[PDB]
Amino acid sequence: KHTTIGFKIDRPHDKVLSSVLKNKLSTYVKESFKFFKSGYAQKGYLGSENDSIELDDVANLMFYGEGQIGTNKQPFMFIFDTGSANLWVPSVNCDSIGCSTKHLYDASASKSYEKDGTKVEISYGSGTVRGYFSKDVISLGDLSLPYKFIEVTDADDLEPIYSGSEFDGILGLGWKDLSIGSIDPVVVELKKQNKIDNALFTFYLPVHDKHVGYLTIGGIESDFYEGPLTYEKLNHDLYWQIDLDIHFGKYVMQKANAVVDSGTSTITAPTSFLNKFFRDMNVIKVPFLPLYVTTCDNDDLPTLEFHSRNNKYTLEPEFYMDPLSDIDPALCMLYILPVDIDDNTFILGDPFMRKYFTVFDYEKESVGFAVAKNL
């Protein structure tokens, strides 16, 4: 009924596990864990100021390569960003060495191009791009619309991520125009132009395949979930985040800020909060590897809880643990990592959304949750 587009996910731990096998670091990982099990060193290690998780360690990049712009169907690889409204592609006029390997946009080749030319710059966490506004028809599956996007002519300040990544541009699934302008995100614009039923999108992330996800635009496919669909009002005008009381075992943070983001590869929690939980659960960090590890048969590990005013969400260990099958199947890595955004911000990333189908509704200014149906 509603347009569904498949995407692929670049899982950050895949290159880490690859490196571990390639550099013969399996024994190092195993002995590191064994060392805290030898009881020699008392504490159990959870990292340091220099040995800590960074935002890049939890970036779950969502790639979509079927989008096209203009009458001559110019192809691009996009990544999704749930944190902003902007859509941009690199210009044929971009002279950056980063642009030399990308699919470029050529306005002169599209009969539906409409000039704007207003100079603009936008900044992400990984850097800044500059260019100017342009309008043309963007196609995403069976949806097409004239849309005002940014044509990037300078991507020098998006280094080293840009030249080292396989995307051309970014497609915004958030609220905030990062520029001086106030351009609606593409899902809102689709609704404004009467091309979809409602200004909403959903994420279905199949539990059986962690490298794929599905984005549905314009309405809810009930085949994706079972049981109640429940909504939580956003606690912010510009981001998909909500208020939740969050329980990690006996540790509770009341009225936490929970960001819902399929672009984050793990659950994240404030470092001080998570370290108390991990210490109790005999979880350790492998020194200078982005890996938190415990035994798979660890029967202290609880079902996480997330309480709103009216609803209660839970996440069983099977969703936030995965065995290190190529190292030692008795050892599991955890998909809960420490990230300090502020005092009370958690991110409900990929593992949460493998259990819960999610609805992002611009009209209702709410996120909806339902237990995903595994197909």
Next chain:
Amino acid sequence: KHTTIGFKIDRPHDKVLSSVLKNKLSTYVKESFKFFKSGYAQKGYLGSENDSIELDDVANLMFYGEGQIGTNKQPFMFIFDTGSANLWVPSVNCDSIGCSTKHLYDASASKSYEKDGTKVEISYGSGTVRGYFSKDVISLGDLSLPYKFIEVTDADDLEPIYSGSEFDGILGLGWKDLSIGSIDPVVVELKKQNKIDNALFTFYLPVHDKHVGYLTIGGIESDFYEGPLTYEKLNHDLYWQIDLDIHFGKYVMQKANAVVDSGTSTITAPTSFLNKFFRDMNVIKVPFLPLYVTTCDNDDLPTLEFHSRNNKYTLEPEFYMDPLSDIDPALCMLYILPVDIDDNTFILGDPFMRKYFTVFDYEKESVGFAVAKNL
């Protein structure tokens, strides 16, 4: 000619390595080193706020020799400690668990015992003993004098080192500190009572028997050194501390304070200074073990230099490293540790004393160094 007393030497790294072996951590040590010298993550690794060197446990060298008290010459093993000015033995009145295996002083069995009874608490490293003052005849080699010392009645806070080591008490070869007590240390008192030629003592650690050393009291034995013997005036009133410019390869600290110490198993250096040197030399800390390791075939390791106003002392790599023969004979441990004791302060412990015959002169308020005679 002058009184020479032999002593046993207890080096703390032997206990560390025995524990590594017993706990089957040899592979952990080797793989940890292989990980970090590989430089995969960074040019690590040198510890952190959550992986630190603890001075008192890690580097507690013990020289211990025989002494007697009382007219029935009750025998004790004393630590010969240049960092303190107290003399104490455990009392028959000590009911501490740790005292149950020690030689205990019995005042009632000595005709020359004179009561005092003033109660005191004195500290050593992270530990303290409590007891009270007594006076009796102390015998050291062929010397004998009436002396005021402490009978310890509570050694509970000197655990676990007390019950884990062979010594009974401690003999102070340091300076009187009136904020602790007013008793002149035994070597000063011996000269006061005209029982030795001069208020000085020396240490000789012959290389041909590494588990034994020699304390000489009252004068300098020519048999123990070769070449010139040069003195350095103390730059402190309470400690055997001197002013040096110190070279660790290309890293130079001007106006360093260096304490010569019979209770320290390593050279110690300020962390920021030493870490620069270790990074350059591919020296790595084994995480959560007090071991700094490199390959034995490391040709970059330099002869350390110690410059005073008039003299220059040096310490070749042979003195500050040793192969880890029972773990991996291709790896060597370094006897240099990062400890922040105070501004610009280094300790010259065992590795320095193994090259240099050392003279501690109370009258000249100086230390003296000469190359020790070893065939």
